[PDB]
Structures are given as structure tokens and as C-alpha cells.
Assembly symmetry: D2
Homo-oligomer: 474 residues x 4
């Protein structure tokens, strides 16, 4: 049980009810996190709004100082946190430690990027002569209270990516980690507690995403909603937000276009690492291959042999393929598998499920009439759709309701660049698997994949507004 | 009747049903505008989405070229359009002509500002050594189809402010003017038709905002909703938008803080011109004076004498105070007047209504318990709230549900600048009435006053997204 | 004779002495331009400094207005000016007209780019907590009087490229065109005169570059020296400038690296148009080919056949190859030709000179020991240096004392991009002949090729300074 | 003697000849620094140019890493270094330690500011339709070898301010500290040595500024000259630089304009701290007061009483006023004192010199005909010039050959802002003594006060160039 507590207004607090967390792989009970009540949610928010003024009052240098202390601590206790996070979400140990490190990176980067964010002075004379002596001194300002909600696959990394950019600007935070990953989320909160930030500046909220979900978003105290999860909730949040600003990173069905002149080995390598990373439980993974027929056979054989080299097993053993987050999920994946299989798809690797451990499947001959060709599995299954023209590949790629990223494997760069302009995605990688790729670059998604632009700098601009003082020079 | 038609996919079209427009002041019938059906709305949208690709294909120089042609034509026919616009919304002739001119200005400014909007190149090495040879070539892109909805008080000016920034970037437009101001809105469309933009690039939609309102917003073809109107609809739009981007300029209750060291004459002059402009039918007008008691009496007397100099009458006569847009409105204002009056407010000028022509009223001694102290009238009524400290004035100012702009009349600039940081508004004017002030400066509103940042440059960034091509340098 | 006059302080003035100008090709006398005295140079400068304050006082919109009027006029009289410019510097008619048009473009572009140049607001708190309430409002300002000196090959285009960016910012100008091209330079001044700019804002200075050269540069009234010419003068100017800012575009020996995978036809086409443009009298022309041995033979044959298609003759006949600016020049070129020839080079096309008309020569087998391999001819002679490795080509390319631009013809873009980082030039073109390429892009040169960065935006920043007002917010 | 060595290509080296350094106050021998020969200077430069390529090859993150290590070390040994620096240049102990701290700050700030410096992508279509598919990927690059020369009053602070911004960008350094301050300069080099930067990246050059001065600047290996010292040498450097880029911070005679509505107490406080800081041995000190007659008497009395409170004595005792750097200097100051005195100035405080310790003098009634009214003393002497109009004060202020900074003490900010536009300085402080003010703000000087813009960000842009790769999208 252990009984983890929330960090609220400078204090750790338990609740009348709890939620027991178990290890997706072994089944062991890791502990229990609070099941907050709306009354409690109200005190978190009240504490934050109360403390916002004086946080804003601090200097950027001082706020950046705290953020650095937090990241330092994270790096210190990276193995401790990694060991648990690994267990809580069935992620390989080493990989789980990496998540803690990349979080420290994002926190530090966000800290330094935040104190170098500047304003602008505008001339009335640029618009009309009569206003030549009129100027506008424009400076940025925080939006207020920011609600951050991280996903199960990156409960820590995708939490700091919201927390740090928000805090450096002068906003206050209310962190709501995923229930499955709430211990890890609270382990992160420990870092913010030790760093010593003023009481009320950083707060956590745990509990039944059903019991308190809509409540926390609809609350009038929240000025900005920063979320990462499924399209379904993202959509609800967009409506519950009203006219309040939001940042949403929803799902994705990232394609990998392979032209006739591509480096099939370089391509097979990138597609495997992208498609099967974390058992396909990544929104930015390569979810479908649109390969030109003439090179389909050769490419597919490479991918096939490469799949046969992926280790399958337990987190503690750093297996490439580990048990999916839960049964509801592994079942869903199983559905997509069958449907494709039934419709004629060709599994080049063995279809087999051990509990919630689904072995990596390579389906060749997948078609547009299969669910696997469009629906986001979030499991180790990769469909290969054979096209006969770059024109068709673009058409099929754009058809998807999603638009996170895309990949183009070719040697003709001017072409790759031209295709890239046509793909309805946020980012196109020319010769490399899709990845968030250094958190300094902008990250965004077209269509149902989200709302808003991410990346340290863009996150900071998003969660800030502008105040403009205009005066006349004598 | 005349029977004005919509501009759809390069053609002017009537509908089975029409809506007759009458002059707010005289009552004369100006003509009739189409009452579209959802079937028709579907063709407007279908035409636009069909034409978007090739508009995006053009060069910025070519798109900017068309926009300049439009503005040229507007300047040419400024009297023609002004004469009607003046009649349709009871605006003074000269002033109505100014609206047409300022629209040409915004269109030209948006055209040149648009072709100088550039991208950025990012270094993988700024984040992590291992990615030093990885770069991100980031360029802007249009969002697609943009729905522009202008208000009755600026059916033309607040239409071009959305249309031009949107088109230069590569977006297509579906213009929906207010029913009262739909002839003027269609007069503007004539300019876009003569300019010769490709068919489907610019389109108009007219009809019962009730019969087709939600339909046009909720339509899945619309990628961005740019609106200007009441808070009530703005709120509906924020929900109907879902997770699609929006720009909303709602209401306002702009305060004018007058400190003990202010230039009472300079102040009285600015407050009058702000408060009584267009009979108070401006979202950015000075709607409440928070004056320090020690100078309240003197200041109020100046304002009083100045009010007595405002001409009252008909549009064609360029009267300062003209008939309110309609009866529903003049009634609402009458309500606020009585309530304040009943509660003890002191009308320093005569309360009198002739049809829909309400004479300018100056209410001294207004208090927090009066509706006039918080609700946006949109009529010629100005409340004077006497405070006893800058601290109180800030408190009362921030209490309002609105946050468009504010004014501070003082000589202590460092103070004015400090106060400005505390006011929950988008812009603070130090010694001058609130105004949009040269459409190149950013324009935004805090709280219920809106969502998004305006001003030519900011409008262009808002209705654009970003595509990021990442590659590795060998 | 005609007897052209200088435009000084709003008036056209002749001088006691004149300089007669003759047509490089026919020999006819075009007319005569003033041979100013230092006394007269002092009045030009005194007029400018006197008028600077009130030009700065105008609004950007007003200054941009004048600049547009100038460009309009240029476009109007493009044939008139083109006809003479063509004769004065032995440039093809059509091409000379193009120069006038591109000048109008640069003037308009500079005008609009100039009124959108903005300032910045900085936070004391970004550096140290104790200064959190301290801010710096930074705005640009003009440097004052700018001296612009254009070259003979672009007496008009390379004059406006300095004049427009300088004037829009608030600086005043003293234009000194090349003696051979001074009629065309004065023809441009006519445009600035008709546009009606205030007296003293724009002024011309003509005369013996020997008699008045150093005098005009060393004068204490000049705040910035913007020059385009030979390395020799550029160097003198750098010393005579002292610690005053300068912009220098000197010579160049641009290489064109051709890798084994290049499109030899696309390459031969680009190299010909670059190398033989204006008879090689372009600083940005392809002056040496560093081709990989394996493709040297095939490539060279294409270039050879293509050279044989270049028309040779008179300006009025739009010949590809026209008479060189003068005898001193054609002689120098003849020297380089012989030396190479003597040393073993292989002329694949006929060596022949008719007066000052040297026919286009293609020298294969040129080596490092030849003058043609390093010295800038400024005549229609192209050396082909055969290398055996990209490593060698880079080495040979960088050896040159020049560094304007370079070209890489290959299909391996990541490679091209990697090579580009190693080349000591200002710009690298991947698959295309070197060109200034749209005057919006930055233009600069490494090593002896210059000092400063050009391109409309960069030119504007160069000829401006910054004023920073710092104050404390209460 | 100790016998300090230079840090050259990763090694510490003595020279055949040395220069013995003595403590300005006590006279004690601190030690001896090398007196290099041009042969040695050639090896420093050869080492640097040799190592430049691979330093540029590193990632920004790695270069920033080294810079942070250096600053950490400086903070560690701040007392050690402070103790000596205090002795070497007669600076108060505590103050000397502050110099070491502020250096660490600038080094760290420069490190983080450097890795967030980005490029831009330009559109051919912004200029001309035909080039719409042409784009320019512009990225920054280092200039190469940078020569940094620090002053005696900041041998360390004004060295790091050049070193850090230069190194983070990819340049190599050759540090030349002032002879009087060369031990401290070499103490700084120790930090760069311990940090472990690659050999040849950072180097020091010491020796007779006469014996090797021009040699080190004129050397063809140096690509950029960054200097801080007297106007005399600055001017020589501007000529010896040729057309190579430079950064020069020369002298100053900063005025403090005091209007009739100023806070005389707040003003007297700021003027004393600025004027008498480091015995007036600061280029940014308040060197002349231009006060409106009506408040001259009252203001002057405050300043007078405040002067009487300044401690006078030895460095180790943290005296406000310590011995001037040397006799040649104290003599020069004595000259200015007498001249003014002879001409009628009125010393309100005692004129007295003890060796090289000149007591702080306040001269009222100074006039334009006195040397003290224009010449930069660099000693504790403050002239009060009484004016009768803001117009006159501006006139007198601008008359000076210098233009570093200025101060305006008034309550009328719009006026202060208007005056500021007229003052020929780089920075204007409204109500506060002149100061460099947080090294993140831009720092520059008008007229003979320098060439180039400083401040961490601006320093980085200055010592960098731009490479532009242009290509066509298919
Ligand atoms: N700068 C400005 O112009 C400015 C600033 C602030 C506030 N305003 C507003 O201008 C308003 C005009 O009066 P109003 O009460 O009629 O406000 P409003 O309904 O918000 O008017 C604005 C626009 O809303 C349209 N509309 C109504 N329902 C719709 C819906 N369901 N979905 C989409 N569009 C719909 C109207 O067309 P129809 O007229 O046919 O219904 C009109 O084009 C004022 O009340 C004031 O708040 C203007
Ligand atoms: N087209 C280009 O943009 C382009 C680009 C790169 C290089 N170039 C250069 O154009 C050059 C043409 O030869 P050039 O003889 O014209 O070279 P140049 O004399 O150095 O340059 C010509 C310009 O400088 C003036 N000038 C000469 N001596 C001067 C001095 N002492 N001080 C100030 N100005 C002085 C000339 O007037 P005068 O007529 O009286 O000499 C003319 O206006 C080539 O060598 C080439 O390097 C042109
Ligand atoms: N804030 C400040 O730091 C600041 C600001 C403005 C003005 N100042 C100036 O600082 C000066 C203090 O130094 P100073 O009086 O000796 O003046 P200075 O010589 O101009 O400046 C000293 C620096 O210049 C070096 N140097 C001398 N001749 C050189 C040459 N010809 N080529 C290259 N470098 C050379 C010196 O070497 P050596 O010392 O070995 O001769 C030393 O590092 C004062 O005159 C004052 O006007 C300081």
C-alpha cells in the first residue's frame, strides 16, 4: 500500500478514499494513491490562485533557479524513480530511467529559455503619420493557473514538459497524473517539494479520472488546460474549456512513405525502431508503411528479419516488447489483428498473446478496408500498405483523421520537401523514424491529433499572454 | 428591395427567401439580402475547400497583389459604400466613409505584412550533442478555410481585419456579415469580386443568424472561426468550435482611472470622446470612470459641460449622438438608466429618449450596487464611480467580468506602468481614451472579453500553422 | 554633350569642369557629367546633414510613401533609362531595362520592409533579481548621412539597393555613381527629384574618382560608407572609414563544384549562364569549375557546345557577349588568357579579340599554377580545374582569397549541405548557378570579398543604430 | 616575482623577458608577467587557427558546458583572485571580489544565450513570384580568431564579457589583458585551463603594449578585434583593423540632466554613487551635472554633504576613494583641477593629493571654458554646470565628443523620453545614475565613445557571420 499522498499547498495529504496501483506485468501492488473529492480539488485550486501573485512577483532568474534545483534532484534520484516508474507502467528499466533524465533536461531547458523571452516596442508611425509619437511597450505575462494532465506512457516526461515552461513564465500548477502512473507522478512531485518552491505554486491532484475528471477541467479557477491523452477526452476538454486556452496532444497514425530510391536497409532499421518502440505504445510511432510496390518485397523481408530480433519479456529485463498497459488494451489490439487477418492481411511473424503480452506482428498486404490501416492500435502491430505511386501514398496518408508526423525515405530531397508540403502533419522527417526529436523543436499535430504547438519555446509562449502599455512621447 | 446577392464561387446568387433591411433612423427599406439554406452554405464551403490548394500554390507576392487591388477599389468607391453603410447602421456619413478607408488601410497593411512573414532553422545541438547534425526547417502554412463574422458597428472594418490577414497567408474565406449591415458587407464583397481573385477563394454567406448560425460554425469544413460580437455567442462558438482554433473579440466595460495628479482638462477631453463615440456603441469605449474623490467634482463638471456640446441627431448630419441600432437595444439601455437613477445615481444631463435616440447621460455618484457600474450598455450613458485610493480603483476595475482595455490619467508614469501590470486587460493607455490604436499594435482582451490576439501581424500568425521538415546533414 | 547636372539640395547644378562620357561599343559621346570640386562636395554634405533631422522626424509611412513614388516613376521611364544605360556600359538593351525594373522592386521592397522593423523590451530580472523592476525599451535609429557608391556593371541596381534601405530608416543620402555609368546614375536621381523628397535628403556627387575619391570617404560628415567595387578600393575605404561603419561588396572567384552524381546537363546549363553572364562582368558569376575527373570529359563537352551558341555582338542587338567596359580591362583579360594558354591550358573555343570584344573562351586542363585559376578576370573566360576528390575541391576552393558564393551540383543533399559548411563563402547554391537570388535573402562575402551583410532587411539593420531608454517600474 | 606564465596551446610558458608588477597603493611587487616576442605571438595565433575547426565542430551544448565549468571555478576561487586583483589595480577588496562574481555571471549568461541563437528561412516568393519555390536556409557561423583586450579598471569582467560570447559561437580566443592587471588576467586564464577546454581554443598574450601592441592587432590571423580602452588606441585599432570587424568601447563624459521637478535627494544619491565610483575611474560614471539653475543650490548642497561621507584610503579597507592607477594619471587629474580652479570654478570640498590619492572634489560654477567641463578625468572630480533651460542642457550635452550614456532626473516621463531621443548617447537612464545595468541589455556608445553594440546577446551576434544555403523545392 505505502499510501502515497498529494502535495497540496506545501503539504502532503492523504484522502478518505484511495486507489490501489498494481504492476501491469507481475500484478504486484505498488501502493495506493489518493482518491480526491471535489472539496479537496477546490483547496488545491484555491491555494494556487492565492499564491500566483507573489510567484509572478519573483524575478525570472529566481524562478529559473528553483526549476534547476528540481532537475538536479531528479538526476540524483533517477534510479529510485526509474525502478518504480518501470514497474508502474511496464516500461523497461533503463528506458524508465531515461524518461527521468529527459525530464530533467526539459526542466532545465525550459528554465533558461524562459528568462530570455522578451517583449517588443511598436511605432504608431508605421501605421499612420498622425500617431508617429505613439509607442506600444509590449511585455508577456502568465495566464494564471495551469492544469497539466500527463499520459500513462510518459507520466513524468510529459508532465515536466508542461510544468517547467508554465512555471518559469509566472503561472501556478495543478498536476494531474494518470491513475496508472500516479505513483511516478507523485514521485516527481517530491522533487518540486524538496526544491523548496513557495507553497501553493506547484500542486498535485490524484483520483478517479471518472469521479473527478470533468470537475477539474470545468472549474472556473483553471485558466489553461494542458492535456495529453486520447482523442476522446481531448475533444471533451476542448468543449469543457469553453473559450479558455488549451494545448492538446491527441493520437496519431504516423505513416512512413518509402519511395523506389530509398535506402531499404536504413529504412528497415528506422521503421522497426519507430513502429515497435514501447510495444507501439507511443503516439509518435510509425504506425503504417506506404511503400512503392517495386521495393515492397525487399523492404518487407528486412523488416521481417529485424522483428525476429526484438527481445520479448519483462521490464526488469529491458525487453523490447513488454506487456501492454492493461487487458482492455491488449484486447483492443487483438481485435484489429483478427479483422486484418480475416480480411486477407498476411502476418509474416507469429500471432501470439501471453496474458497481456502480445508478440510483435508484421502484417503485409494490409488494405484500406482493414481497421488496422486507420485505427491507432497502441500495440506491437505494423501494417504494410503497398502503393503504386507517390500520388497515392499522399492521398492515403492524408485520408487519416490524424496528423502528428510522417516520414519520407528517399534520396530526392527536393521531392521529399515538396511531398512534405502536402502531408497534413505537424512534422515530416526525411530519412529517419518519427520522433519528438529534441524538445527544442516545435511539436504539433494536424486534424484530430491536437490543438496548439509544443516544444520548450512554443509551450512557454502558449501559456502566456501579453500586456501592452501605450503612451505618447513628448 | 434591390435584392442583393451573395458572392459564391465567382458568382452572385439570390436565394428563395430574402430578408428586408431598413434604415435604423428613417425606417426606409434599403433592400433585401439572401436568407440562405444549409444546402447553399454547403456549396459555399465546398467551393472554398476546392479552391484552397491552388490559392496556397500562388506566391505571396501574387496574393498580396490581389489584396492591394481590393483596397484600391474600396478607396475609389468610398463615398458610394459610405453613403449606404451610414444608413444601414445609423452611423454618421463622414464616419462611415472613414470605416471604408480604414478597411483599405488594414487590407494593404495585411498584404505587405504577410509576404514578410518568415520561418526558422533549429539546431539539434542546442538540446543534445548527439543530434548536432540534425536541423529543423520550420515554415508557416495556412489552416485552410476561415469563417469570418463581423459585428453591426463595424460590418466592413471588422471584416477586412479578418479577411486580409487570412487570405495573404494562403487561407480561403467564407464571410458572414451581420444581418443589420449585410448590404454593406455585400458591398465589400463587390470589391473582392472586381479585384478578380480566383473563384472560390472569397465567399459570402448571408441569412438569419438564427436559421443558419450554429450550422455555419459547427460545419466540419471550417478550420478556424474568427468572430466579433456579444459574449453570449462568443461563448457558444468556443464550444461549437470543439478543438478547432478561434479568435473572439467579445464585450468590454473599459475603465478610466483618474489619479489626483491628472490633467483634468486633457482627461475630460479623452473620456468624452471615448465614452460617447458612436453613442457608446463601441466595445473599446470608456465605459466607467474610477476617479479619486479629491478631483471628482472638478473633473465631473468638465465632462458635464463637454457633454452639453455633443450634437444629437441624424447620420446624414454627422451628429455625435445618433439613433441606437434598434429598439431592443434602446430599451435595454433605458433599463440600466432607470436602475441607476432609482438607486440614487445623479444624472447631470437630461434623460430623454426620442424613438431610439437616447440623449447622452452623465451619471455621477454611481455605485457598485448599480447595474450601470458593471453591465455593458452600448448606449450613450457614462457612470462616474468615485474612489478614495488607487488600490480601490484597481480592485473595482479588476472585479469586472471584462478585460479589453483600460486608461490611466496621471503624471507619475512609473506608477502608471506599475498599475498597468495589475489591471486584467489586454491594453492600458497612459493619458488617452481607449482605442484600438493603429491596427499594427496587438489587440486582445482578458477574461470574458475574448480569445486570441489581434492586430495585423498577430492575426496572420493566428490563422496559420507550422510545418517542420527535419533532416540530417552529412 | 547634353551636360548632365547633379541633384544637390533640391537643385540641379553644373560644375566648372565636366567629364565626357562615350559608349564603350560605338564610341559615340553620350554626354558629359560634372567634375565636382571639394568645395561643392562640402555643400552636398552640409545640405544633407542640415536636412537629416526633419527626415527622421517624418513617420515611416511617409518615408515609405516617397520611396514608392520613386519606384513608380522608374517603372514608367524604364525604356528611356534602359536605352541610355545600355549604351553607357555596353549592356544588352533588354537586360539594361531589367536592371531598372529590379531597382524599382528593391526600392518598393525596402520601403515596406522598413516600416515593419521593430524594437524590443528587455527584463532586468532575466539577469539579476535585484533589477526585476528595471526594463529597457530598445528602438532603432538612423546613423545619419550615408555615402553610396555603385559599380559600373550595375550603376542603377546596386545604387537603389543602398539608397532605399538607408532612406526608409531615416538616413540621408549622397550618391556617387561610377564615372562610366554616371549618366545612368543621374537618370536615377531624376526619379528621386520628381518623387518630391524634401531638399537635402537625396543628393548626387559626380566627378573624377581620383580627384575626389578619398575626399568624399574621409570627410567627417559621412557616418556610413556603402561601397561596391574592386578589392583595392574596398581596402582603402576600410582604412579611411576609421571606426565608422561600412558595407563593402568586393570581388569574387566563385567556384562550381561538380560531383560524380551530378546532372551534367542541368549543370552545363547553369554553369554557362553563370560564367558567361554579361561577358563575365559579374562579381557573382561562376568563375571556376572544380569537376571530379570521372565526369570532366562529358561535362566539358556540353559546356563547349553550349558556348558555341552564345550570341556575340552589340548591346542594341541583345548579344550574349558584348564589348568589355574598356581597353584597360580587355587587355588584362587577354593577359590571363595567354598565361594559361602558355602554361598548357586547352582552349576548346576560339581565342579572338575584336577591339574590346573578346569572344567566350573555355579553357580545359587549367591548373593551380595558372593566373586564370585564381585571379578575377571580369571577361568571358572560364577555367575547368579537374579534381579527383571532394576533399581536394574544397581545399582548392577555400584557397582563394575570395569568398562570395559557391555552387555544388550533386544529388546527395546531406553531403551538399555538409560541404557547404566547409566552403568559406557567404552563400552556397545546391544545383543552380550562383546569383544574388531575390534581394530579400542575405548577401555577403567571406575573406577579401567584403564586409557586412546585404539583402533588403540586413541592409536596413546595418545602416541603423539603437537607442535604449531604461527606466524603473513602480 | 612569482613569475606568472601565459597559457599557450594548452601549456603555461615563460618568456626571456618579464615585466614586474607593483601594487598601485603600497608599491609592493606582486610579481612578473611575460614580455612576449612577436615570434611567440605568432605561435599563439598559429595554435588558435589550428584548433578553430574542431571547436566549431563541437555542439553548442558541449561548448556551453565548458563555459559553465569555467564560471563555477571562478566562483570557487573568488576570494583568492579578488585578493590579488584588489592589489594589482587599487580596487577595494569586496569590490574586486564582485568583479570576479559578475564575470562568472556573464560567462554563464553568454553560455546559455549562445545555444539558443537561431537561424531563419526566407521565401523567394516574398520578392518575386518567379522565385516562389526558392528558399534560403540562413544559419550563423563564427568569424574565427577573436582578439580580446581588456582595460585596467576591469581586467577580468571586461575580458569575460568578450571571451564567453565569442567562444560559445565557435570562435577561438587570444586574450591580451592590460599590463597593470596582467596577473589578474592570467589568474582568469587559470580557470579556462582547469575547465579543460581543448588546447589552442583559449590563449593569453602578455607583454609591453608598446613592444607588441600594433603587432597583435595588425596580424593577418586575427579576424575580429574586441577592445576596451582609451579613445586614442581605439582610433588606431579602427585603422589597423582595415576592413576586419571590430568592437570598441572607448571613453565617456556622461552627463546627468537635472530638471526643476526632480527628486533632489534621490538625485543627489544617484549622482554621488555614479560620479565617485572607483574614484571616477569608470567610463560609465556621471562626469558632469547639467542642473537647472532654480534647483542648483539645493542639489549642490546635498551632493556636498554626501561627498563628505565618502571614505578615503586603502583597498584592503574598502575605501570609497582609493589611490589612482598611477602617477601619470593623478597628475593629469591635477591639471584639470587647477585649470578649473584658476578659471573661477568653486571647489566645495577640499583639494588635496597624498601621493596618488586625490580626495573627492566637487566643483560648482564650472563653465564651458574649463577643461573639466569636457575632458574625461578618470579621477574623483565632479563639475556642476548650471543651465537655464532643458534646451541648453541638451545642447551642452550633445556638444561633447563622447556619447556613452546619459541620465535625466525628472518626474515628467513623456518629456524625459522625448529628451532621450535627442541625446547623442547609447543609453539614457530616467532617474538613476548611469551604469552598464545588467549585462543582458544592449551597451553602446555614440560618437568617439566606440563602435559596435555590446551586451551578451549583441556581443554574440557581432562576433558571428552568416552562411546562407539556397535551394529550389521541387
Ligand atoms: N468591435 C466590435 O465590433 C465589437 C466589439 C465588441 C462587441 N461587439 C458586439 O457587436 C454586437 C452586435 O449585437 P448582437 O447582440 O447582435 O451581437 P452578436 O449576435 O454577437 O452579433 C455579432 C454576429 O453574431 C452573429 N450571429 C448570431 N448568432 C450566431 C450564431 N449562433 N453563430 C454564429 N453567428 C451568429 C450575427 O449575425 P446576425 O446579426 O444575423 O445575428 C453577427 O454577425 C454587440 O451586442 C456587441 O457585443 C462589437
Ligand atoms: N556588379 C557588382 O555588384 C559587382 C560585384 C562585385 C564586384 N564588383 C566590382 O566592380 C569592379 C569594377 O571595377 P572598378 O574600376 O569600377 O572598381 P572601383 O573603381 O573600385 O569601383 C567603382 C566605384 O568606386 C568609385 N571609386 C574609385 N576610387 C574611389 C575611391 N578612391 N574612393 C571612393 N570611391 C572610389 C568609382 O567611381 P569611378 O568611376 O570614378 O572609379 C565607382 O563609383 C570590379 O573590379 C569588381 O570587383 C561589381
Ligand atoms: N569602463 C572602462 O573600462 C573604460 C571605459 C571607457 C574608457 N576607459 C579607458 O580605459 C583606459 C585605461 O587604460 P589606458 O589608460 O592604458 O588606455 P588604453 O591604453 O587605451 O587601454 C589599455 C589597453 O589597451 C592596450 N594597448 C595599448 N596600446 C595598444 C595598441 N596600440 N594596440 C593594441 N592594444 C593596445 C593596453 O595594453 P597595456 O596596458 O599593456 O599598454 C591595455 O590592455 C583609460 O584611458 C580610459 O579612458 C575604460
Amino acid at each position: 500500500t505505502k499510501q502515497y499522498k498529494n502535495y497540496v499547498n506545501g503539504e502532503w495529504k492523504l484522502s478518505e478514499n484511495e486507489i490501489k496501483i498494481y504492476e501491469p506485468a507481475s500484478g504486484a501492488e505498488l501502493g495506493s494513491v489518493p482518491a480526491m473529492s471535489t472539496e479537496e480539488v477546490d483547496y488545491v485550486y484555491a491555494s494556487a490562485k492565492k499564491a500566483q501573485p507573489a510567484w509572478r512577483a519573483l524575478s525570472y532568474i529566481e524562478r529559473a533557479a528553483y526549476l534547476h534545483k528540481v532537475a538536479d534532484i531528479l538526476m540524483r534520484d533517477k534510479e529510485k524513480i526509474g525502478a518504480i516508474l518501470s514497474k508502474e507502467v511496464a516500461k523497461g528499466y533503463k528506458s524508465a530511467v531515461s524518461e527521468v533524465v529527459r525530464t530533467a533536461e526539459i526542466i532545465n531547458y525550459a528554465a533558461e529559455e524562459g528568462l530570455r523571452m522578451e517583449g517588443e516596442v511598436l511605432e504608431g508611425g508605421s501605421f499612420e503619420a498622425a500617431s508617429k509619437k505613439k509607442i506600444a511597450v509590449v511585455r508577456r505575462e502568465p495566464v494564471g493557473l495551469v492544469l497539466a494532465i500527463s499520459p500513462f506512457n510518459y507520466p513524468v516526461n510529459l508532465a515536466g514538459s508542461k510544468i517547467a515552461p508554465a512555471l518559469i513564465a509566472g503561472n501556478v500548477i495543478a498536476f494531474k497524473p494518470p491513475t496508472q502512473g500516479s505513483i511516478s507522478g507523485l514521485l516527481l512531485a517530491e522533487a518540486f517539494a524538496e526544491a523548496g518552491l513557495p507553497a501553493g505554486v506547484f500542486n498535485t491532484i490524484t483520483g478517479r479520472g471518472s469521479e473527478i475528471g470533468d470537475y477539474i477541467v470545468e472549474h472556473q479557477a483553471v485558466n489553461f488546460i494542458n492535456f495529453t491523452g486520447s482523442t476522446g477526452i481531448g475533444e471533451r476538454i476542448g468543449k469543457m474549456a469553453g473559450m479558455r486556452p488549451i494545448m492538446l496532444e491527441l493520437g496519431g497514425k504516423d505513416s512512413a512513405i518509402v519511395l523506389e530510391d530509398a535506402d531499404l536497409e536504413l529504412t528497415a532499421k528506422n521503421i522497426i525502431a519507430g513502429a515497435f518502440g514501447y510495444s507501439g505504445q507511443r503516439s509518435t510511432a510509425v504506425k503504417r508503411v506506404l511503400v512503392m510496390e517495386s521495393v515492397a518485397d525487399e523492404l518487407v523481408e528486412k523488416i521481417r528479419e529485424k522483428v525476429l530480433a526484438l527481445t520479448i519479456g519483462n521490464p526488469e529485463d529491458d525487453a523490447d516488447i513488454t506487456p501492454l498497459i492493461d487487458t482492455k488494451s491488449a484486447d483492443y489490439v487483438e481485435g484489429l489483428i483478427n479483422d486484418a487477418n480475416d480480411k486477407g492481411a498476411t502476418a509474416l511473424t507469429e500471432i501470439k498473446r501471453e496474458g497481456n503480452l502480445i508478440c510483435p506482428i508484421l502484417f503485409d498486404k494490409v488494405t484500406t478496408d482493414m481497421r488496422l490501416a486507420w485505427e491507432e492500435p497502441f500495440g506491437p502491430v505494423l501494417p504494410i500498405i503497398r502503393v503504386t505511386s507517390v500520388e497515392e501514398a499522399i492521398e492515403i496518408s492524408n485520408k487519416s483523421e490524424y496528423g502528428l508526423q510522417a516520414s519520407i525515405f528517399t534520396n530526392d530531397f527536393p521531392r521529399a520537401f515538396g511531398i512534405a508540403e502536402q502531408l497534413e502533419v505537424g512534422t515530416v522527417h526525411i530519412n529517419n523514424k518519427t520522433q519528438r526529436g529534441t524538445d527544442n523543436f516545435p511539436f504539433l499535430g494536424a486534424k484530430k491529433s491536437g490543438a496548439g504547438i509544443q516544444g520548450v519555446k512554443y509551450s512557454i509562449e502558449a501559456m502566456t499572454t501579453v500586456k501592452s502599455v501605450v503612451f505618447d512621447i513628448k
